[PDB]
Amino acid sequence: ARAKAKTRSSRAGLQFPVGRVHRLLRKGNYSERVGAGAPVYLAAVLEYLTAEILELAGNAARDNKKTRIIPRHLQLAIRNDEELNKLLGRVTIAQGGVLPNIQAVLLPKKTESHHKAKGK
């Protein structure tokens, strides 16, 4: 009952492996018995997170006229979104850098009044 090549596995555009997670969770000393629908859910969540991160980093990469995803682009993209920063608040990306932001209250003279006189 071979019939023809029944293409599946990576169905519905789910490019994440739906099986290596189950293999890594069984030997990972997590639980005694692992279900079948859990790896699918985990792979879907991981693929959605990766796709969101990539689509949020590519838009920031295209702003600097760069079609490459450098670590600086990922650092600027993660530290921009609210949910992405709340999820990755303790993660420090190597070769990333601080977000370009200055600070107010830096000049102490502000008004710059005439302490002298008009007539010398």
Binding site: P71, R72, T92, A94, Q95, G96, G97, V98, P100, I102, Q103, V105, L106, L107, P108
Partner: protein, 96 residues
Amino acid sequence: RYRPGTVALREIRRYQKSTELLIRKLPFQRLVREIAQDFKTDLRFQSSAVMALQEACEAYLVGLFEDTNLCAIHAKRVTIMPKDIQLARRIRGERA
């Protein structure tokens, strides 16, 4: 003489728009080697390990300096004080 106040912001923007290393490699390697020798002798180091150590130290120093500046600028002072670092470390829970 012109009033300063613009070269500092220019240097800040130039160093923020670049991702280059500021601390050297050989002095940091010698320092971590001397520190490791205090616990156990006959120890070596790699390149990626000391690179990750330098990156973590740079991130920690940047965060500490940012916290110190944010604590000092809220007290009507543009400069920071040596006690502000200890204050930030006590608030964050690094030394108790």
